[PDB]
Design a protein around this ligand. Structure first.
Ligand SMILES: *[C@@H]1O[C@H](CO)[C@@H](O[C@@H]2O[C@H](CO)[C@@H](O[C@@H]3O[C@H](CO[C@H]4O[C@H](CO)[C@@H](O)[C@H](O)[C@@H]4O)[C@@H](O)[C@H](O[C@H]4O[C@H](CO)[C@@H](O)[C@H](O)[C@@H]4O)[C@@H]3O)[C@H](O)[C@H]2NC(C)=O)[C@H](O)[C@H]1NC(C)=O
Ligand SMILES: CC(C)C[C@H](NC(=O)[C@@H](O)[C@H](N)Cc1ccccc1)C(=O)O
Ligand SMILES: *C1O[C@H](CO)[C@@H](O)[C@H](O)[C@H]1NC(C)=O
Ligand SMILES: *[C@@H]1O[C@H](CO)[C@@H](O)[C@H](O)[C@H]1NC(C)=O
Ligand SMILES: [Zn+2]
Length: 818
């Protein structure tokens, strides 16, 4: 008869200090433990409820003292993942007791809790390690505890191990003691007050490289012995970032050391474990044969994210999981603030707003986690730019200092910052409400009118925000603020302006629309002097215009006249906005009869980017986003028979066919070159042969693309059947080829006519196949093309939209083009 019926633990029995002894066998894959918890009762009681999961409790007793011990009855409630310890007599309030529990268990084979993980040496031998992953609720798998983040305590952790291994944990190793023949007991120092999910220990045979920060904090990277030489980058990144955070938060790194460990088969793939963060090997290790340029960038931000938690989230952790979004939101946001300073060469800035746009697009739906954590960061950025960067900085410092080693709620962050503007009430409009507002700007003389409304793709919501508006003016030279608390508000300028732009820097989590013809002046501004506003300002314009176009508040030509400025753009962010909203348009024309508009449109696009495309070096140099633009520009140009790039491309492909595939080819350009090369029936075949010795590389996927891009319909249809056969390739690729051909202007009918025919035997191999049903019909725009198609319930909608868009815009695009 279990004495507790709540998922949450009783609040009247409180842990103070854990003494953990874990003895794990990395051969038999089992572990025994003796954990002792010092507790205090605030109310009299003879039952102690706590957390346990998949642990066989051998023995539990209660100690007090001058010493006295007594057995505890043990009841399990596996559903709730809880135990109950029954005492003979009630506990004396305020008096310190100690619970001693003996238990045993099998190392997790599920990559959570205290789990087994493996790797193979270059010699090919298989090694075992034991590792931890507790967030959110897995500590109870390694040892019994009060497994809620509010129950903080100190931890004395002891690991028994073989001499061929080494244990690392949260705190530094104090002493190693030979305990028996093949047994050593590692004692690590007592932790500071922390939550269970942040406790961690690793048993393995890793190497390490170590550097010492300016403040004397020892930073080390542990990795598999064969790969330890790839930690040099992460280690340096860790050191400089730790130093950054110590300055920013104006609070010294709380712990004696910081250990970053690269874990085989890690599935998180990063964790904020206090003093011992863990990562997937690709997020920490770097080879001169890198997975990509993105990896360096990838690992420089994954680190920065986990290191930021050392302060925000560990030193001051949430009270409960409902605030996890703030923990994660802040770490994401901090990825940028830190790196932008620390590693400017990486150009992290671009990728931030991308995720903000991504978040918004999803919030704009009827329905409304990593993206929710992206909104958190976006929100924070908004707030940080409203209040000065320093007001923000100090407010955070105060938050950390006031709540160090304790727990927190959302309001606590707001309260702390609001004490340096009713931040709390404002922020809750953004936190307790799904979606974001569309903001319409109406000007009447010096009278500037603002209005807000819940922006969503029937339309009837009463949502209302406290929005931190910002704006610049053809006259002003400085950025203005205005707090929009109501449905509408006015604002009076000292004099009439030639143009006004809101959401400066694109730092705010909202889209703005200009009434009358503010767009006219803005697109007039961009075509005259586009540098008059920031790069991101230009990007937000392009982005908002084409969104407003898709909801019927802006006319397609107004947003196209806008893009005309792009002929002069040099910055990545805007160009990608342009491309992201323009391309899809002709991909709907491609799957339609009318070829004249399709061709004039493509002609228009290449005349816009002409200059930019020419400036492209045909190398692999530059930052991740610089390389992504080079890659996409060239591919585009050659796909649209822009002669200059097509010619060059042909040349390169010839030098590489007669190579044969021997001389190296820059990955940025290979996508275009292969594409061009696959156009000849002999080049297509060469690629297909070279397609096997592709080395399971990135190169394979590049060819796979080029092959599907040929205009030879027989060679396309051919790829279709063969990737369905067992002999040449089967399940691992067909789904992706089908969609790739479904996007070829001359190959879409085949993939459609194929999904229909072979449908029966096709379904024969239903959650990952939805990709194939979208990628085959996603871009139809005809009413009749619908009569045909009549899980993938979404694909039916998206076409409906494609048609509306066409019935409205096609006639405007046609006239525009002339
Ligand atoms: C996880 O669990 C394993 C068992 O599953 C523990 O492994 C045992 O560890 C002990 C201590 O390291 C090993 O003991 C050694 O046995 C030797 C004789 O071999 C016996 O066992 C082997 C292997 O099965 C048989 O082939 C052989 O026929 C025998 O039956 C002894 O010679 C060793 O002597 C040691 O003790 C003497 C006396 O004090 C000393 O003088 C020696 O110098 C030396 O210290 C030793 O007793 C035992 O063999 C291991 N098992 C196996 C199967 O090999 C792991 O220790 C444990 N590890 C962890 C990290 O938890
Ligand atoms: C966004 C990245 C830079 C960092 C990210 N990692 C994190 O956010 C970590 O701090 C998280 N601790 C990862 C996590 C969250 C929830 C449950 C288990 C593990 C990751 O992708 O691994
Ligand atoms: C051809 O080039 C490859 C490197 O791409 C090289 O490893 C190989 O040895 C070369 N073949 C020669 C030089 O005969
Ligand atoms: C570990 O698993 C085995 C079965 O593979 C089981 O018999 C054994 O009792 C388990 N050990 C525990 C639950 O402590
Ligand atoms: Zn995190």
């Amino acid at each position: 008869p279990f004495p507790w019926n709540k998922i949450r633990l009783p609040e009247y029995v409180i842990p103070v200090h854990y003494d953990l002894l874990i003895h794990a066998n990395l051969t038999t894959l089992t572990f025994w433990g003796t954990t002792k918890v010092e507790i205090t009762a605030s109310q009299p009681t003879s039952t102690i409820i706590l957390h346990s999961h998949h642990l066989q409790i051998s023995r539990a007793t209660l100690r007090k003292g001058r010493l006295s011990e007594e057995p505890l009855q043990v009841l399990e409630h596996p559903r709730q993942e809880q135990i109950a310890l029954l005492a003979p007599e009630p506990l004396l309030v305020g008096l310190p007791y100690t619970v001693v529990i003996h238990y045993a268990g099998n190392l997790s084979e599920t990559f959570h809790g205290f789990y087994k993980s493996t790797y193979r040496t270059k010699e090919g031998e298989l090694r075992i390690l034991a590792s931890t992953q507790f967030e959110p609720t897995a500590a109870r798998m390694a040892f019994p505890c009060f497994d809620e983040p509010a129950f903080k305590a100190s931890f004395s952790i002891k690991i028994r191990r073989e001499p061929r291994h080494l244990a690392i944990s949260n705190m530094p190793l104090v002493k190693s003691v030979t305990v028996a023949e093949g047994l050593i007991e590692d004692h690590f120092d007592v932790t500071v007050k922390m939550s269970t999910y942040l406790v961690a220990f690793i048993i393995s045979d890793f190497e390490s490289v170590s550097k010492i920060t300016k403040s004397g904090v020892k930073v080390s990277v542990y990795a598999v012995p064969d790969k330890i030489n790839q930690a040099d980058y992460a280690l340096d990144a860790a050191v400089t970032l730790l130093e950054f955070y110590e300055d920013y938060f104006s609070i010294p790194y709380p712990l004696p050391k910081q250990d970053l460990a690269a874990i085989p088969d890690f599935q998180s793939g990063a964790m904020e474990n206090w003093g011992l963060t863990t990562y997937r090997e690709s997020a920490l290790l770097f080879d001169a044969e890198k997975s990509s340029a993105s990896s360096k960038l990838d690992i420089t931000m994954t680190v920065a994210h986990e290191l930021a938690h050392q302060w925000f989230g560990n030193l001051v952790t949430m009270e409960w999981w409902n605030d996890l979004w703030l923990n994660e939101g802040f770490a994401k946001f901090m990825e940028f603030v830190s790196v932008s300073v620390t590693h400017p060469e990486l150009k992290v800035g671009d990728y931030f707003f991308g995720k903000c746009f991504d978040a918004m697009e999803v919030d704009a739906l009827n329905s409304s986690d990593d993206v929710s954590y992206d909104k958190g960061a976006c929100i924070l950025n908004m707030l940080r730019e409203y209040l000065s960067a320093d007001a923000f900085k100090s407010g955070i410092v105060q938050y950390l200092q006031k709540h160090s080693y304790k727990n927190t709620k959302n309001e606590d962050l707001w309260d702390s910052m609001a004490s340096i503007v009713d931040v709390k009430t404002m922020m809750n409009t953004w936190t307790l409400q799904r979606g974001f507002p569309l903001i319409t700007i109406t000007v009447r003389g010096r009278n500037v009118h603002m209005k807000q409304e819940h922006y969503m793709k029937a339309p009837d919501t009463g949502y209302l925000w406290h929005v931190p508006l910002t704006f610049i003016t053809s006259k002003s030279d400085m950025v203005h603020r205005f707090l929009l608390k109501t449905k509408t508000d006015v604002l009076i300028l000292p004099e009439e302006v030639e143009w006004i732009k809101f959401n400066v820097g694109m730092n705010g989590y909202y889209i703005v629309h200009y009434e009358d013809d503010g767009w006219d002046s803005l697109t007039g501004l961009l075509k005259g002097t586009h540098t008059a506003v920031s790069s991101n300002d230009r990007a937000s314009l392009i982005n908002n215009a084409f969104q407003l176009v898709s909801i019927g508040k802006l006319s397609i030509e107004k947003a196209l006249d806008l893009s005309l400025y792009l002929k002069h753009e040099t910055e990545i962010m805007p160009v990608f906005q342009g491309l992201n909203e323009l391309i899809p348009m002709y991909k709907l024309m491609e799957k339609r009869d009318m070829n004249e508009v399709e061709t004039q449109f493509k002609a228009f696009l290449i005349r816009l980017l002409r200059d930019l495309i020419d400036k492209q070096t045909w190398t692999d140099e530059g930052s991740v986003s610089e390389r992504m633009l080079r890659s996409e520009l060239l591919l585009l140009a050659c796909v649209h028979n822009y002669q200059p790039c097509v010619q060059r491309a042909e040349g390169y492909f010839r030098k590489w066919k007669e190579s044969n595939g021997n001389l190296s080819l820059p990955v940025d350009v290979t996508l275009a070159v292969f594409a061009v090369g696959a156009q000849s029936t002999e080049g297509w075949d060469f690629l297909y042969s070279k397609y096997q010795f592709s080395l399971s590389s990135t190169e394979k996927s590049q060819i796979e693309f080029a092959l599907c891009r040929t205009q030879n319909k027989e060679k396309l249809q051919w790829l279709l059947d063969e990737s369905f056969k067992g002999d040449k390739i089967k399940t691992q690729e067909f789904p992706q080829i089908l969609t790739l051909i479904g996007r070829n202007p001359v190959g879409y009918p085949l993939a459609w006519q194929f999904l229909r025919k072979n449908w029966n035997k096709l379904v024969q191999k239903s959650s990952s196949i939805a990709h194939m049903v979208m990628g085959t019909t996603n871009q139809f725009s005809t009413r009749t093309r619908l009569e045909e198609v009549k899980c993938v319930q979404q694909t039916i909608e998206t076409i409906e939209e494609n048609i509306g868009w066409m019935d409205k815009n096609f006639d405007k695009i046609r006239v525009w083009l002339q």
